Design an enzyme around this catalytic site. Structure first.
Site, PDB file in Angstrom:
ATOM      1  N   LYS A 149      10.108  -9.312  10.849  1.00  0.00           N
ATOM      2  CA  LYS A 149      10.727  -9.324   9.708  1.00  0.00           C
ATOM      3  C   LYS A 149      11.939  -8.560   9.412  1.00  0.00           C
ATOM      4  N   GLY A 152       2.412 -23.138  14.079  1.00  0.00           N
ATOM      5  CA  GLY A 152       1.920 -22.267  13.465  1.00  0.00           C
ATOM      6  C   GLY A 152       2.863 -21.342  12.632  1.00  0.00           C
ATOM      7  N   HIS A 179       6.845  -9.363 -17.899  1.00  0.00           N
ATOM      8  CA  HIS A 179       7.892 -10.454 -18.148  1.00  0.00           C
ATOM      9  C   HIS A 179       9.308  -9.947 -17.846  1.00  0.00           C
ATOM     10  N   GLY A 195      -7.109   1.738  31.219  1.00  0.00           N
ATOM     11  CA  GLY A 195      -8.409   2.211  31.076  1.00  0.00           C
ATOM     12  C   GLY A 195      -9.357   0.943  31.711  1.00  0.00           C
ATOM     13  N   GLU A 226       8.662 -19.227  12.004  1.00  0.00           N
ATOM     14  CA  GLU A 226       9.578 -17.997  11.675  1.00  0.00           C
ATOM     15  C   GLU A 226      10.569 -17.948  12.798  1.00  0.00           C
ATOM     16  N   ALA A 252      -2.579  -8.504  12.028  1.00  0.00           N
ATOM     17  CA  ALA A 252      -2.426  -6.960  12.108  1.00  0.00           C
ATOM     18  C   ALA A 252      -3.483  -6.302  10.815  1.00  0.00           C
ATOM     19  N   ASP A 262      -7.769  -8.691  17.634  1.00  0.00           N
ATOM     20  CA  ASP A 262      -7.517  -9.917  18.201  1.00  0.00           C
ATOM     21  C   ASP A 262      -8.340 -10.298  19.310  1.00  0.00           C
TER      22      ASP A 262
HETATM   23  C1  LIG Z   1      19.536  -7.307 -23.181  1.00  0.00           C
HETATM   24  C2  LIG Z   1      17.806  -7.471 -23.443  1.00  0.00           C
HETATM   25  C3  LIG Z   1      17.081  -7.408 -22.184  1.00  0.00           C
HETATM   26  C4  LIG Z   1      15.765  -7.429 -22.376  1.00  0.00           C
HETATM   27  N1  LIG Z   1      14.903  -7.383 -21.183  1.00  0.00           N
HETATM   28  C5  LIG Z   1      13.724  -7.350 -21.403  1.00  0.00           C
HETATM   29  C6  LIG Z   1      12.931  -7.688 -20.300  1.00  0.00           C
HETATM   30  O1  LIG Z   1      13.265  -7.652 -19.119  1.00  0.00           O
HETATM   31  N2  LIG Z   1      11.259  -7.597 -20.279  1.00  0.00           N
HETATM   32  C7  LIG Z   1      10.770  -7.674 -21.756  1.00  0.00           C
HETATM   33  O2  LIG Z   1       9.768  -7.677 -21.860  1.00  0.00           O
HETATM   34  N3  LIG Z   1      11.767  -7.506 -22.937  1.00  0.00           N
HETATM   35  C8  LIG Z   1      12.963  -7.408 -22.712  1.00  0.00           C
HETATM   36  N4  LIG Z   1      13.593  -7.347 -23.880  1.00  0.00           N
HETATM   37  C9  LIG Z   1      13.187  -7.519 -25.058  1.00  0.00           C
HETATM   38  C10 LIG Z   1      12.654  -8.835 -25.657  1.00  0.00           C
HETATM   39  O3  LIG Z   1      13.777  -9.467 -25.851  1.00  0.00           O
HETATM   40  C11 LIG Z   1      11.989  -8.729 -26.897  1.00  0.00           C
HETATM   41  O4  LIG Z   1      10.943  -7.628 -26.691  1.00  0.00           O
HETATM   42  C12 LIG Z   1      11.411  -9.942 -27.466  1.00  0.00           C
HETATM   43  O5  LIG Z   1      12.447 -11.106 -27.749  1.00  0.00           O
HETATM   44  C13 LIG Z   1      10.520  -9.766 -28.906  1.00  0.00           C
HETATM   45  O6  LIG Z   1       9.988 -11.047 -29.124  1.00  0.00           O
HETATM   46  P1  LIG Z   1       9.878 -11.490 -30.627  1.00  0.00           P
HETATM   47  O7  LIG Z   1       9.494 -13.092 -30.581  1.00  0.00           O
HETATM   48  O8  LIG Z   1       9.031 -10.711 -31.300  1.00  0.00           O
HETATM   49  O9  LIG Z   1      11.241 -11.100 -31.254  1.00  0.00           O
HETATM   50  P2  LIG Z   1      12.489 -12.259 -31.088  1.00  0.00           P
HETATM   51  O10 LIG Z   1      12.755 -12.820 -29.946  1.00  0.00           O
HETATM   52  O11 LIG Z   1      13.707 -11.492 -31.856  1.00  0.00           O
HETATM   53  O12 LIG Z   1      11.928 -13.374 -32.234  1.00  0.00           O
HETATM   54  C14 LIG Z   1      12.582 -13.208 -33.573  1.00  0.00           C
HETATM   55  C15 LIG Z   1      13.076 -14.621 -33.977  1.00  0.00           C
HETATM   56  O13 LIG Z   1      12.871 -14.874 -35.524  1.00  0.00           O
HETATM   57  C16 LIG Z   1      13.809 -15.169 -36.109  1.00  0.00           C
HETATM   58  N5  LIG Z   1      13.824 -14.906 -37.341  1.00  0.00           N
HETATM   59  C17 LIG Z   1      14.133 -13.585 -37.957  1.00  0.00           C
HETATM   60  N6  LIG Z   1      13.853 -13.618 -39.250  1.00  0.00           N
HETATM   61  C18 LIG Z   1      13.364 -15.017 -39.655  1.00  0.00           C
HETATM   62  C19 LIG Z   1      13.102 -15.637 -41.022  1.00  0.00           C
HETATM   63  N7  LIG Z   1      13.191 -14.901 -42.055  1.00  0.00           N
HETATM   64  N8  LIG Z   1      12.815 -16.812 -40.844  1.00  0.00           N
HETATM   65  C20 LIG Z   1      12.757 -17.388 -39.609  1.00  0.00           C
HETATM   66  N9  LIG Z   1      13.067 -16.845 -38.380  1.00  0.00           N
HETATM   67  C21 LIG Z   1      13.275 -15.820 -38.584  1.00  0.00           C
HETATM   68  C22 LIG Z   1      15.151 -14.689 -35.456  1.00  0.00           C
HETATM   69  O14 LIG Z   1      16.367 -15.658 -35.519  1.00  0.00           O
HETATM   70  C23 LIG Z   1      14.599 -14.923 -34.014  1.00  0.00           C
HETATM   71  O15 LIG Z   1      15.016 -15.807 -33.133  1.00  0.00           O
HETATM   72  C24 LIG Z   1      15.234  -7.470 -23.659  1.00  0.00           C
HETATM   73  C25 LIG Z   1      15.941  -7.381 -24.867  1.00  0.00           C
HETATM   74  C26 LIG Z   1      17.376  -7.482 -24.688  1.00  0.00           C
HETATM   75  C27 LIG Z   1      18.283  -7.360 -25.689  1.00  0.00           C
HETATM   76  C1  LIG Z   2       5.935 -12.437  16.972  1.00  0.00           C
HETATM   77  C2  LIG Z   2       4.921 -12.143  16.168  1.00  0.00           C
HETATM   78  C3  LIG Z   2       4.754 -11.857  14.868  1.00  0.00           C
HETATM   79  C4  LIG Z   2       3.690 -11.501  14.291  1.00  0.00           C
HETATM   80  N1  LIG Z   2       3.739 -11.514  12.939  1.00  0.00           N
HETATM   81  C5  LIG Z   2       2.749 -11.075  12.298  1.00  0.00           C
HETATM   82  C6  LIG Z   2       2.562 -10.860  10.790  1.00  0.00           C
HETATM   83  O1  LIG Z   2       3.638 -10.989  10.177  1.00  0.00           O
HETATM   84  N2  LIG Z   2       1.484 -10.189  10.246  1.00  0.00           N
HETATM   85  C7  LIG Z   2       0.402 -10.117  10.999  1.00  0.00           C
HETATM   86  O2  LIG Z   2      -0.602  -9.713  10.330  1.00  0.00           O
HETATM   87  N3  LIG Z   2       0.148 -10.527  12.318  1.00  0.00           N
HETATM   88  C8  LIG Z   2       1.410 -10.756  13.056  1.00  0.00           C
HETATM   89  N4  LIG Z   2       1.298 -10.770  14.192  1.00  0.00           N
HETATM   90  C9  LIG Z   2       0.071 -10.633  14.794  1.00  0.00           C
HETATM   91  C10 LIG Z   2      -0.305  -9.175  15.166  1.00  0.00           C
HETATM   92  O3  LIG Z   2       0.749  -8.792  16.136  1.00  0.00           O
HETATM   93  C11 LIG Z   2      -1.456  -9.084  15.997  1.00  0.00           C
HETATM   94  O4  LIG Z   2      -2.532  -9.470  15.253  1.00  0.00           O
HETATM   95  C12 LIG Z   2      -1.989  -7.573  16.114  1.00  0.00           C
HETATM   96  O5  LIG Z   2      -0.912  -6.644  16.839  1.00  0.00           O
HETATM   97  C13 LIG Z   2      -3.196  -7.638  16.802  1.00  0.00           C
HETATM   98  O6  LIG Z   2      -3.341  -6.039  16.803  1.00  0.00           O
HETATM   99  P1  LIG Z   2      -4.664  -5.494  17.933  1.00  0.00           P
HETATM  100  O7  LIG Z   2      -4.268  -3.935  18.043  1.00  0.00           O
HETATM  101  O8  LIG Z   2      -6.051  -5.891  17.910  1.00  0.00           O
HETATM  102  O9  LIG Z   2      -3.879  -6.028  19.461  1.00  0.00           O
HETATM  103  P2  LIG Z   2      -2.430  -5.451  19.920  1.00  0.00           P
HETATM  104  O10 LIG Z   2      -1.449  -5.223  19.169  1.00  0.00           O
HETATM  105  O11 LIG Z   2      -2.161  -6.352  21.089  1.00  0.00           O
HETATM  106  O12 LIG Z   2      -3.156  -4.171  20.836  1.00  0.00           O
HETATM  107  C14 LIG Z   2      -3.441  -4.193  22.010  1.00  0.00           C
HETATM  108  C15 LIG Z   2      -3.055  -2.847  23.040  1.00  0.00           C
HETATM  109  O13 LIG Z   2      -4.061  -2.611  23.795  1.00  0.00           O
HETATM  110  C16 LIG Z   2      -3.542  -2.246  25.124  1.00  0.00           C
HETATM  111  N5  LIG Z   2      -4.376  -2.513  26.010  1.00  0.00           N
HETATM  112  C17 LIG Z   2      -4.678  -3.743  26.868  1.00  0.00           C
HETATM  113  N6  LIG Z   2      -5.414  -3.640  27.533  1.00  0.00           N
HETATM  114  C18 LIG Z   2      -5.738  -2.340  27.763  1.00  0.00           C
HETATM  115  C19 LIG Z   2      -6.460  -1.631  28.744  1.00  0.00           C
HETATM  116  N7  LIG Z   2      -7.474  -2.175  29.502  1.00  0.00           N
HETATM  117  N8  LIG Z   2      -6.258  -0.277  28.561  1.00  0.00           N
HETATM  118  C20 LIG Z   2      -5.745   0.159  27.763  1.00  0.00           C
HETATM  119  N9  LIG Z   2      -4.950  -0.249  26.791  1.00  0.00           N
HETATM  120  C21 LIG Z   2      -4.911  -1.615  26.916  1.00  0.00           C
HETATM  121  C22 LIG Z   2      -2.055  -3.235  25.090  1.00  0.00           C
HETATM  122  O14 LIG Z   2      -1.215  -2.688  26.170  1.00  0.00           O
HETATM  123  C23 LIG Z   2      -1.878  -3.161  23.720  1.00  0.00           C
HETATM  124  O15 LIG Z   2      -0.749  -2.407  23.436  1.00  0.00           O
HETATM  125  C24 LIG Z   2       2.275 -11.254  15.013  1.00  0.00           C
HETATM  126  C25 LIG Z   2       2.477 -11.526  16.244  1.00  0.00           C
HETATM  127  C26 LIG Z   2       3.599 -11.947  16.899  1.00  0.00           C
HETATM  128  C27 LIG Z   2       3.559 -12.027  18.516  1.00  0.00           C
END
Ligand SMILES: Cc1cc2nc3c(=O)[nH]c(=O)nc-3n(C[C@H](O)[C@H](O)[C@H](O)COP(=O)(O)OP(=O)(O)OC[C@H]3O[C@@H](n4cnc5c(N)ncnc54)[C@H](O)[C@@H]3O)c2cc1C
Ligand SMILES: Cc1cc2nc3c(=O)[nH]c(=O)nc-3n(C[C@H](O)[C@H](O)[C@H](O)COP(=O)(O)OP(=O)(O)OC[C@H]3O[C@@H](n4cnc5c(N)ncnc54)[C@H](O)[C@@H]3O)c2cc1C
Ligand SMILES: Cc1cc(S(=O)(=O)N(C)CC(=O)Nc2ccc3c(c2)OCCN3C2COC2)c2[nH]c(C#N)cc2c1
Ligand SMILES: Cc1cc(S(=O)(=O)N(C)CC(=O)Nc2ccc3c(c2)OCCN3C2COC2)c2[nH]c(C#N)cc2c1
Lengths: 464, 464
Positions: free
Chosen positions: A50, A180, A443, A113, A185, A317, A309
């Site tokens: 990763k 696979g 949002h 073991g 990856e 894992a 496994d």
């Molecule tokens: C910089 C910034 C970032 C933001 N980021 C986020 C965010 O990440 N997440 C989030 O959830 N919120 C965010 N907000 C808030 C979000 O913009 C508001 O909560 C949302 O727009 C409110 O929706 P609304 O439709 O109720 O109001 P508005 O979006 O203001 O809709 C009102 C509309 O009605 C119109 N209107 C007004 N009076 C009249 C009328 N008499 N006749 C006809 N039309 C009229 C206006 O012209 C306007 O277009 C952010 C706000 C700002 C300023």
């Molecule tokens: C390149 C790669 C990428 C992967 N990416 C992901 C991923 O993103 N997500 C995911 O979910 N899985 C991923 N996997 C799979 C993941 O590695 C395995 O599913 C996981 O390790 C299995 O867990 P386990 O403990 O059962 O086996 P193992 O991790 O293999 O543990 C077995 C351990 O037991 C030991 N052992 C064996 N025999 C004996 C013994 N007789 N006595 C004592 N100890 C012993 C071994 O030395 C080993 O350390 C990936 C695998 C590879 C190869």
């Protein structure tokens, strides 16, 4: 010769989470691990890759999108630094696993073991000695290994994920066998750092486990990025000549030779079930060579459990974590809940755009007999997606008509992996599209596209 | 003259969503708007400012974090391009609102509407004529306007959000009056593009509506970024001398003079309730000069409704959308659900790290008599947060002890705004920490930190 309530074999995501949970429920716990604390995931798997994917995403912005964002100047990227950072991220989480073992008073045993019988484990210590360990219950969490293309072998220029992710230097060209999640990856990282990349998939779609609409979208993105994907193609032979590798593939019955500097085998994983005495303990394998388990992760032996496994159910894992909790709660007699159908568990691919899904595809739901309602919302209608500068992809939900119960969901877009928890929570606790459609979403976020598809399922999409 | 079932006054997020919903339920609908199709949000508010925040985030990576990511070279950034892009994003969504009006067969009326009585609206057309419009029901969605510091006035160098967000050029220094969400986002954009920034807040915390732990974290980040935040300070006077503006403030009873090139007034918003004949229709105002409404958004006049910022309940765009749906379903007699306590609705601030919250703060829950259990998980224990390169912030959940019902949640970190939908879905439909703790989360994502806090509420956090 010491005795524990629970011994854990392997210390990856499943093993070390199970041991902690068993420590929380009052059981005395030991965990045996020879090599990777944190297993494959933390050392050479999820975690380090990763970090590399994040770097590749920034190369792709600071070059492809520079003019659009008003970024000027000659910008170069060093892959060596990206590698250095991925290893520092990995080392930091391994230190975390040791702190957690210490906090919970879990006995770490550094060794390999082997079962001597149904209650005795013989450990070969890394320091050179031997140790015996009797238990009441044991959790097997030994992971899986890489599966190789039949007939081929590893060598200098033919490698698995482990040698590639530990390479500080890059090749000029590479052929990746397998489309696979892990293959895509590596393709995505290497193409953004200037490697020439080809990916060979045997099935006719890339990410063949995803819904067909998701495969079509991701194959379009990868083509745009410059990766060559050959689908419905079979790898026949791999020959390492020293200076280059010749990969013979067949498609439509016509033989064809590709060439690269390296080949990455990434076609799948086989459970580790050999060499540590599963037959001395009496544990039975399935027909696919996994350890068989029931719904509480229990093997055919009453006090032995198998998580992660190594049972083959779903090799991720977080699945391994969830199974270890079930296993530990079942041993302690505490309140637990089974995971159920493992098809409902989420999964993701962490190229950019991400791919995230859960449950059934549209076609799987029609073939299984549901009354299918589908709702699809594109990210060109999402205000936040336009603000971030990547408005591609979509959200697609699959539901059942009689009550509007969720059956699956399939997302492709910027960081969509984070949007799955609302969906899987509704599916697991029986919330319908009617309930979901009443949840207000902040949002503007990528998650508003979910709310739009909820309205589409109940019959009135507003913003599209 | 002409008659409609429903006339909508104003075409912002609330007005145009209500009109669509009324069109979906079979009512003949007209919408009256003189200036902003999409209102403040799409034209000069949420939408354009998210595009500018994305640009500022990339300047902050391609300069502060260049060495860590292996990015070398002399990189410059043009704010003019960032402005050009924010206006193209805004124009693209306005075209979307017109397409949606056309699709739903809604009659657009380009003018300013004024009530003649309880059923008649007189419109002054932008083209110069007059029109009369009788209705059965009317939805007032006229938004709010900027509130000014008492005693001051706008001028060349003293401006509101609208003139700042439409400026292609930047000043050398600026004083922002008000540390609400809008003020912090302008501070964050302008500081990353080289402006010298000071933010004056009357209350003793920045983002005084958030939980105190969230304010402490965000004041630390902004100080690190170089913004000067003066809390518990009162703006007394603003004097525009032409070349500079002298802002007189008092803190602890000591007078102090600040200086800058521009001053941005951003202390709040007052509903628009004057000039369009609310008294001819008989609609009654509250003591804070908002239009009073009940739980179905109905004014004291039985057939007139008021949605969005004009009722003052919670001045966000998604709240305005949700209220318009309720209003429209109530007019049509369709199945609707009230929004309930508006404190439970989510909200977010889109600087980086994000701030996202819902429900009650810890202190509000203690003062209202609950048995409060708190769980806090830091992002230094999140694997994904380390991979992205920003492991700061935390997750903090507030719950009630008897059943583990959610009371609030407060997140600060990388893109946390996207993680709220799981939490608000559980609060609205009565899912407890026990249910949430059983939802498996994809690994590795920022959302796993939620799962950890769910376990903390039921009494066993695992990964920390
Ligand atoms: C910089 C910034 C970032 C933001 N980021 C986020 C965010 O990440 N997440 C989030 O959830 N919120 C965010 N907000 C808030 C979000 O913009 C508001 O909560 C949302 O727009 C409110 O929706 P609304 O439709 O109720 O109001 P508005 O979006 O203001 O809709 C009102 C509309 O009605 C119109 N209107 C007004 N009076 C009249 C009328 N008499 N006749 C006809 N039309 C009229 C206006 O012209 C306007 O277009 C952010 C706000 C700002 C300023
Ligand atoms: C390149 C790669 C990428 C992967 N990416 C992901 C991923 O993103 N997500 C995911 O979910 N899985 C991923 N996997 C799979 C993941 O590695 C395995 O599913 C996981 O390790 C299995 O867990 P386990 O403990 O059962 O086996 P193992 O991790 O293999 O543990 C077995 C351990 O037991 C030991 N052992 C064996 N025999 C004996 C013994 N007789 N006595 C004592 N100890 C012993 C071994 O030395 C080993 O350390 C990936 C695998 C590879 C190869
Ligand atoms: C207040 C607010 C505003 C926006 S919105 O600003 O994005 N907007 C106005 C929607 C929009 O643009 N629809 C649209 C409509 C049409 C089109 C199109 C897009 O793209 C290009 C193509 N065409 C048409 C379709 O035939 C060609 C919101 N989006 C979401 C989500 N999810 C929530 C939300 C809430
Ligand atoms: C499989 C897997 C692995 C990881 S994990 O890789 O991140 N990891 C091993 C946890 C960790 O590091 N804990 C920790 C523990 C201790 C510490 C610390 C961190 O930070 C530095 C400080 N110290 C200690 C605390 O006194 C100083 C996961 N994290 C999440 C979430 N959310 C889910 C998840 C699932």
């Amino acid at each position: 010769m010491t005795h524990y309530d629970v011994v854990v074999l392997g210390a990856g995501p499943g093993g070390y989470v199970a041991a902690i949970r068993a420590a929380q429920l009052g059981l005395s716990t030991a965990i045996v691990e020879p090599k990777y604390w944190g297993g494959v995931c933390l050392n050479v798997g999820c975690i380090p890759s990763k970090a590399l994917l994040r770097n590749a995403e920034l190369v792709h912005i600071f070059t492809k999108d520079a003019k659009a964002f008003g970024i000027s100047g000659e910008v170069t990227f060093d892959y060596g630094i990206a590698y250095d950072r991925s290893r520092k991220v990995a080392e930091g989480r391994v230190a975390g696993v040791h702190f957690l073992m210490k906090k919970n008073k879990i006995t770490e045993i550094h060794g390999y073991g082997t079962f001597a019988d149904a209650n005795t484990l013989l450990v070969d210590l890394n320091d050179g000695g031997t140790e015996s360990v009797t238990f009441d219950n044991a959790i097997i969490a030994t992971g899986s290994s890489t599966r190789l293309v039949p007939g081929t072998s590893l060598s200098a220029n033919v490698v698995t994920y482990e040698e590639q992710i530990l390479s500080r230097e890059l090749p000029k060209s590479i052929i990746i066998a397998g489309a696979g999640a892990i293959g895509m990856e590596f393709g995505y990282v290497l193409k953004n750092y200037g490697v020439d990349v080809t990916i060979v998939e045997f099935l006719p779609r890339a990410l063949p486990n995803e819904d067909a609409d998701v495969s079509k979208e991701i194959e379009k993105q990868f083509k745009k990025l410059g990766v060559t994907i050959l689908t419905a193609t079979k790898v026949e032979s791999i020959a390492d000549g020293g200076s280059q590798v010749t990969v013979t593939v067949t498609k439509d019955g016509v033989a064809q030779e590709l060439k690269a500097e390296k080949v990455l085998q990434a076609i799948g994983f086989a459970p580790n079930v050999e060499g540590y005495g599963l037959d001395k303990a009496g544990v039975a394998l399935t027909d696919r060579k996994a350890i068989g388990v029931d719904d509480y992760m229990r093997t055919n032996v009453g006090h032995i459990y198998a998580i992660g496994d190594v049972n083959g159910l779903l090799q991720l894992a977080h699945v391994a974590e969830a199974q270890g909790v079930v296993a530990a709660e079942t041993i302690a007699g505490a309140e637990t809940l089974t995971l159920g159908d493992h098809r409902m568990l989420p999964r993701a691919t962490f190229c950019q755009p991400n791919v995230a899904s859960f449950g059934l595809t549209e076609q799987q739901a029609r073939n299984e007999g549901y009354d299918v309602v589908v709702a699809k919302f594109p990210f060109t209608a999402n205000a936040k997606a336009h603000g971030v500068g990547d408005p591609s992809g979509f959200v697609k939900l699959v539901a059942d008509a009689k009550h509007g119960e969720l059956l699956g969901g399939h997302l492709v877009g910027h960081d969509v992996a984070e949007l799955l928890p609302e969906l899987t929570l509704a599916q697991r606790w029986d919330l319908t599209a009617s309930e979901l459609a009443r949840n207000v979403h902040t949002h503007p976020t990528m998650s508003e596209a979910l709310q739009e598809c909820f309205h589409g399922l109940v019959g009135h999409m507003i913003n599209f």
